[PDB]
Tab-separated table of C-alpha atoms in Angstrom:
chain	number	residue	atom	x	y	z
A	802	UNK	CA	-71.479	99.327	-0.309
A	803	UNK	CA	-74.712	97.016	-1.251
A	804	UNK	CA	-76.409	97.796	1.669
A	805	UNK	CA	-75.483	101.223	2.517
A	806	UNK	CA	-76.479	102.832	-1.333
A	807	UNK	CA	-80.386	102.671	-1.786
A	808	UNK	CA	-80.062	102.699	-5.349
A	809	UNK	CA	-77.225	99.985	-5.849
A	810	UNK	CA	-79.592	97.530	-7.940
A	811	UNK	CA	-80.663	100.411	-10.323
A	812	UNK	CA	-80.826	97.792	-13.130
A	813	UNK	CA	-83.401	95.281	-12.088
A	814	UNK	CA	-85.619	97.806	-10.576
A	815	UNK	CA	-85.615	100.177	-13.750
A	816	UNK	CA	-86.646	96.427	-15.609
A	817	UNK	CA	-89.770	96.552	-12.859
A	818	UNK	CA	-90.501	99.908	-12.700
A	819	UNK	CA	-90.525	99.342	-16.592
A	820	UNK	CA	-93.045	97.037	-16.399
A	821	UNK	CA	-95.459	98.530	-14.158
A	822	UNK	CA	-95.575	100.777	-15.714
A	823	UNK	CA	-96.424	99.385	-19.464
A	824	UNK	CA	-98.957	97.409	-16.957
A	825	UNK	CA	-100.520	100.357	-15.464
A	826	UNK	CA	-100.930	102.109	-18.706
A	827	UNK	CA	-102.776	99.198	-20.267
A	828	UNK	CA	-105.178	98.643	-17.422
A	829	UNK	CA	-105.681	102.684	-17.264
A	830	UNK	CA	-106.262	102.845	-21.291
A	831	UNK	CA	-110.045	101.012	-20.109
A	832	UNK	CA	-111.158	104.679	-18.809
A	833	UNK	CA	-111.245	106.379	-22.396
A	834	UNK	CA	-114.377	106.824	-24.248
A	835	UNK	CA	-112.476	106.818	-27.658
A	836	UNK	CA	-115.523	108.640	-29.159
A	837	UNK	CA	-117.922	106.416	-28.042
A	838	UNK	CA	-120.918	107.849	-25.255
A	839	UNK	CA	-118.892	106.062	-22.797
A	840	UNK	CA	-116.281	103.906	-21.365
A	841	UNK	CA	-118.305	101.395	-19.435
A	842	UNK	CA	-119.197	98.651	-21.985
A	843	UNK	CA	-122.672	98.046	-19.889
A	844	UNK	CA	-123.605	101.707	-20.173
A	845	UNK	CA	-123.816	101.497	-23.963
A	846	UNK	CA	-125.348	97.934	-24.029
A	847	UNK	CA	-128.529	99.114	-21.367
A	848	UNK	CA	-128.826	102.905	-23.012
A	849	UNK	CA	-128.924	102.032	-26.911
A	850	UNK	CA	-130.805	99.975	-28.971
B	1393	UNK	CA	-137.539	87.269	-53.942
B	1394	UNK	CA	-140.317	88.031	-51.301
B	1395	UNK	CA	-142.858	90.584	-52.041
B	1396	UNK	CA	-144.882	91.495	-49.448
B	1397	UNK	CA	-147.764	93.671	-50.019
B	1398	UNK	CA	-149.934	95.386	-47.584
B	1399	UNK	CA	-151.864	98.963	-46.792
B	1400	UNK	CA	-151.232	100.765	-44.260
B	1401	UNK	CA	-151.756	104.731	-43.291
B	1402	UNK	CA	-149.794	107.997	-44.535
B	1403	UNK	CA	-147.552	108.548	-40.951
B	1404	UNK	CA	-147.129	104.722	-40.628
B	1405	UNK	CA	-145.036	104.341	-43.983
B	1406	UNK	CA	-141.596	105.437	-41.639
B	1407	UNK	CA	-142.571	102.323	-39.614
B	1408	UNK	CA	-141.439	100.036	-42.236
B	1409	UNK	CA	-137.571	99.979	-41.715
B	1410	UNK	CA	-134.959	97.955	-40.031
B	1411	UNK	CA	-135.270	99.546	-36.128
B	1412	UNK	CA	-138.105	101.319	-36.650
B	1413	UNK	CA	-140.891	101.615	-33.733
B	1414	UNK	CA	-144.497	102.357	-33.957
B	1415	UNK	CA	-147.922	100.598	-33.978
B	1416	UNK	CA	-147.074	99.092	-37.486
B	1417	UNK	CA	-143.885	98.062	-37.084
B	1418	UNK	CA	-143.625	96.149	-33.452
B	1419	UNK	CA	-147.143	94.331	-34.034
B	1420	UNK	CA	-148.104	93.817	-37.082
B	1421	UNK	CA	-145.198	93.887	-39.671
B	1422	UNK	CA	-141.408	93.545	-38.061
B	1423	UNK	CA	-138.597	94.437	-40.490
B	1424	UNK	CA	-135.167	92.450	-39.473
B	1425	UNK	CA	-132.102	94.553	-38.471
B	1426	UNK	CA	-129.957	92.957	-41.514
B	1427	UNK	CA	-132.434	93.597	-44.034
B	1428	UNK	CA	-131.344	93.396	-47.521
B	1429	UNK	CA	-133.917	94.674	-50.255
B	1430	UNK	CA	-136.428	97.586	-51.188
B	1431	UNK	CA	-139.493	99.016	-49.493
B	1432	UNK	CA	-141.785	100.698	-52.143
B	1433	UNK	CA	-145.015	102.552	-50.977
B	1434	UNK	CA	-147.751	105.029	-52.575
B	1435	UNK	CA	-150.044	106.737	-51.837
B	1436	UNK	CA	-153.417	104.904	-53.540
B	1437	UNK	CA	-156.581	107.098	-51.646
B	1438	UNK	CA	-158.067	106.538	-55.427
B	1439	UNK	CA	-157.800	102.624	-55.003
B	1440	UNK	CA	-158.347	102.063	-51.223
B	1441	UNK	CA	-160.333	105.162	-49.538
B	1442	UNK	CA	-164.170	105.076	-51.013
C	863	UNK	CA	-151.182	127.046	-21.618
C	864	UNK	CA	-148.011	125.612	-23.446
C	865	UNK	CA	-145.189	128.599	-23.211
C	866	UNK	CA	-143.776	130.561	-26.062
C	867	UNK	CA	-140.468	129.660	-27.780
C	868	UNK	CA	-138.325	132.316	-26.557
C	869	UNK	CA	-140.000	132.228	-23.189
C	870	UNK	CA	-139.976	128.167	-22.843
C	871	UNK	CA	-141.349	126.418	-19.859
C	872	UNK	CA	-138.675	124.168	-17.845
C	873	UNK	CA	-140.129	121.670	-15.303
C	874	UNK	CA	-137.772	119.546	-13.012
C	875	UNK	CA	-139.718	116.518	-12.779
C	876	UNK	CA	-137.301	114.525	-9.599
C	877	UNK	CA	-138.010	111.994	-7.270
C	878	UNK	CA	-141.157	110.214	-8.952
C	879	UNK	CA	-141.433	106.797	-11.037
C	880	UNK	CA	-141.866	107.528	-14.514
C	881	UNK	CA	-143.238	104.998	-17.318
C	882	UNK	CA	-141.899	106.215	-20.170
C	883	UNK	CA	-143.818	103.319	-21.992
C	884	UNK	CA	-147.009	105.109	-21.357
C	885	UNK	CA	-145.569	107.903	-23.667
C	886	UNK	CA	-143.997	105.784	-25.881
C	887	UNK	CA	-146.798	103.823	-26.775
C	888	UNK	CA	-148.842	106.666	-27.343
C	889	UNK	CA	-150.258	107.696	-31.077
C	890	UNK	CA	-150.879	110.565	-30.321
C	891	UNK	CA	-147.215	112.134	-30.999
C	892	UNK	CA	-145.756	112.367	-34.635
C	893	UNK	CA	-142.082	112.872	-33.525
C	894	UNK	CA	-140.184	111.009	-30.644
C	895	UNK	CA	-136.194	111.674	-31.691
C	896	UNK	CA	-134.610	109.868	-28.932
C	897	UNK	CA	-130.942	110.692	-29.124
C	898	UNK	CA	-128.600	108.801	-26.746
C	899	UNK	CA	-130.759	106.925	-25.059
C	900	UNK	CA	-133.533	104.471	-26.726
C	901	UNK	CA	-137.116	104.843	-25.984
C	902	UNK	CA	-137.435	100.959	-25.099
C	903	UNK	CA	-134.580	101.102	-22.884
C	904	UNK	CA	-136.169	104.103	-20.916
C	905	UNK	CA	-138.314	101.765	-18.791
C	906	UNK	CA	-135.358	100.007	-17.396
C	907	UNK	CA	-133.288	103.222	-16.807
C	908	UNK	CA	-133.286	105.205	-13.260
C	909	UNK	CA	-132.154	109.144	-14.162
C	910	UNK	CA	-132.129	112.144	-11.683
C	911	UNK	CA	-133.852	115.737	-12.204
């Protein structure tokens, strides 16, 4: 029964796929301008004063 | 307090302000970012222009 | 022969080295409103068209 049913260990991967996700949101959050000119920190610090 | 005093031109009084850029401003009289205090001017053609 | 204002004259001025400083420097000019950029930061900025 483990190895014939793909989605057996539903448990532990929903706890990963959690996870990843949370992660991937965070490191994809660094893309938003959040009013500012830009979202590259070194686009702001070499076009301002 | 620091009071500094100098004459400069009519178009040049905009120059003296935290930032600003300009003949007056980036070689002769710098004003710090963080400045804290007043910057009084007139116009004295009657004391200064014979 | 400087254009009219509802007639005026665009220029594309691409693929050239431009010192800004030359016209920043400059006395002649009462107004130089630099908005999203700063005029001693143009020197060390490479734009297109």
């Amino acid at each position: 029964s483990l190895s014939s049913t793909p989605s057996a260990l539903g448990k532990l991967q929903d706890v990963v796929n959690q996870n990843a996700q949370a992660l991937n949101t965070l490191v994809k959050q660094l893309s938003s301008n959040f009013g500012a000119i830009s979202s590259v920190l070194n686009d702001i610090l070499s076009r301002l004063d | 307090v620091y009071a500094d005093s100098f004459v400069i031109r009519g178009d040049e009084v905009r120059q003296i302000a935290p930032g600003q850029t300009g003949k007056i401003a980036d070689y002769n009289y710098k004003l710090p970012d963080d400045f804290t205090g007043c910057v009084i001017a007139w116009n004295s053609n009657n004391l200064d222009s014979k | 022969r400087f254009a009219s204002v509802y007639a005026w004259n665009r220029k594309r001025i691409s693929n050239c080295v431009a010192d800004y400083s030359v016209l920043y420097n400059s006395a002649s000019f009462s107004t130089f409103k630099c908005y999203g950029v700063s005029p001693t930061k143009l020197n060390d900025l490479c734009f297109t068209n």
